[model samples]
Target chain A: SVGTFSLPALPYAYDALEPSISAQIVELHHSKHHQTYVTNLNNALKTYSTALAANDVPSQIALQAAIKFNGGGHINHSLFWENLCPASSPDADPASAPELTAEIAKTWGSLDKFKEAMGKALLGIQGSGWGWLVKEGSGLRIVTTKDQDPVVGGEVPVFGIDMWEHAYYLQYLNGKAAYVDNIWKVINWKTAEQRFKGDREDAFKIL
Target chain B: SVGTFSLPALPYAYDALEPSISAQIVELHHSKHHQTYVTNLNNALKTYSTALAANDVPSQIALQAAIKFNGGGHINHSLFWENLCPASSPDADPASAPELTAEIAKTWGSLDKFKEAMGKALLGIQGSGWGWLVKEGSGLRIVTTKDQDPVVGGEVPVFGIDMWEHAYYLQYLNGKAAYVDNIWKVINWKTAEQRFKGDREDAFKILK
Candidate 1:
């Protein structure tokens, strides 16, 4: 059950969404980036078997690199491609994305407040990282994770944003705050709404 | 100059290395994973400049994560894609690849002997990682590093195998040694030879 999921394809063509995302960037991200994770995950599973069969504790521990790296790669990119949108005409303001604005209200109490909160979180990222707004039970909270870690297990990930430079460097350059600020313009509300309406769990159960 | 190179694509078709490697895995590794590193590297360099402009040493240090993470991402995967064969149909005899055998004989005493040494280096890797068969001085040498740190300054990297679980987990599952063993079948000797032939002392200059 754990490894049954395959990486889903993006609804848009690799280069269909331009200006905001270059054709080169999209093609590379989907074909080269995400696939590596899937491959590694599958390979790790195979290695895991032989190690377990042989009761090789050191081998099992050695395989941790492939497990964590590929596993997180598969999990994160699945969420990442779904997190953006090209439907909002190139001219539409990011502030106009409906689900994002609504969730902003739910999570931070207001859009302006959400911007302030998310901005601070992005600024706080330690390295090539991610800025997330997770649903910890009933309470929606803003959080940051380094490398590929998700916030503690209990919090169901509701709204996730990747701040890793690869996510924005081509479009925003070193102006991370600018990229962080601009992505608001293209948040996919339909997905956000779905996450909100679906299986948001309790903080107590998660803890 | 070294810092400016883009992440290269896998040489063979997405399905070319199948059974050993899947088409789906090739697509994501080249497209998504490598692209992210290039993107992150660019962003880190830009931020480093701003930190200098603003006189923010703390911000500069904090950005080390981005630089190392993305930078390592670019460096490691570049060598990774180049180090592999489609399925290693050749080299089946293990004694077959004459050029590789010759290189090992000249540099490491013998091919099987070099493999044993490289295998030991890989086994010794601690925590999350990758292993290298680099060109140190004139002879071939094996070294491993934690996570994605590049072999800079003294070492000239020719061929690198990503021991990182993500590198082969889908096919090999958790069997790292098996994956390691199988990868040899696909080892791209031509690429390794080119790297070896092109070796220059200045190749290890640190990126500023």
Candidate 2:
């Protein structure tokens, strides 16, 4: 019957990650794109709740797509913001996340090897999607989710890259690979370690 | 074993339909986007043929996405080009196909009303897709297909407007409704009438 979720404030200045990601992009990505997901999800949930109250199974099933798409966007964007920092932040240094770095390197054979795999996954994603490095089994793995879908099941997202065209099109045009290359600069290894060590659904307790 | 398909030549010059669709958009759309689909589809088919010969059903199944996405683009773009003409051409005039015009008008109560419904569908399309007017049963209806999927089933594709961001984002940006409005000016009704009157699979006889 009413809107409850609101847009989360950016952790740093919009321009903090500039030279890698543009100020214009962060402003638009946060202010417009991410906010629309929050607004629309609330709208969809309100209707879905009413349908549930009336025991409308068909309407509830139909609402699943809207719920997953926008609700997933809400969670994914929240994780994305927390996983990035100004390139100059102490958190951005890989040395600060020794446990996660050691695990990643062990899985892929080297840190460079790990990044190479991540880059490939990010670029190979067809259409709008997100690429994630998640804890799978006892090893770290790179996986992709198409169109605002969050990682499902027991796996925890260690970090993710936004691969939607809106994420890079304005900044990189068709040069998507460059965005892939540059994203590493601002990856907040400090926050990544927290996410990696944390239990599932803990980091995105988006209150 | 060899490349059998080639890019279909446009009926008119790239810039001929400009100021509405834009020469830049048309050139990149045809020369780059459509060409890649043809190339990728051929490559996929080549590999798929090998897999098929070996009874590699799993590999063949894996290639289905590439085959559908690129192969469908190849077919969709072929239909798209034939269904457009210079705005100034007599073929662009709906009156040129009196039978098709009468049917469309009678179905939607008027041509403008039909276009209004089509416009709503095109804009409503969630992502990259096409908006089609098809022959279903004894009447006509508007439908949409997502990604690069071709219109399946026995329904004949009367004509379609591409709703891919590439179709309008370069020219209209987020002003997609204007693209929908202006597209009517270049729609080739002459070929559309042929499609409407023909049997399924008869119109996209790509060579025809």
For every candidate, how close is chain A to the native chain A in TM-score?
0.81, 0.96
Off by over 4 Å in 1: A1-5, A87-103, A106-109, A200-207, B1-208
Query: For each candidate, what TM-score against the reference?
Result: 0.50, 0.87
For this target, which candidate reaches the highest lDDT against the unseen true structure?
2
Please identify model 2 stretches exceeding 4 Å from their true place: A13-16, B9-18, B86-89, B172-178
CAPRI class of candidate 2: acceptable
TM-score of B-chain for each predicted structure, in order: 0.81, 0.96
lDDT of 1 by residue, A130-183 (tens): 677666666677887656665547666655677655565445544567766766
Q: Model 2: per-residue lDDT, tens digit, A70-177? A: 888898998899899999999999998999999987888888999998898897765568999998767788889877888866798899999876677566655679
In order, the Cα lDDT scores of the candidates are 0.66, 0.85
Identify the CAPRI category of the predicted complex in candidate 1. incorrect
What does the lDDT read for residue B139 in candidate 2?
Answer: 81
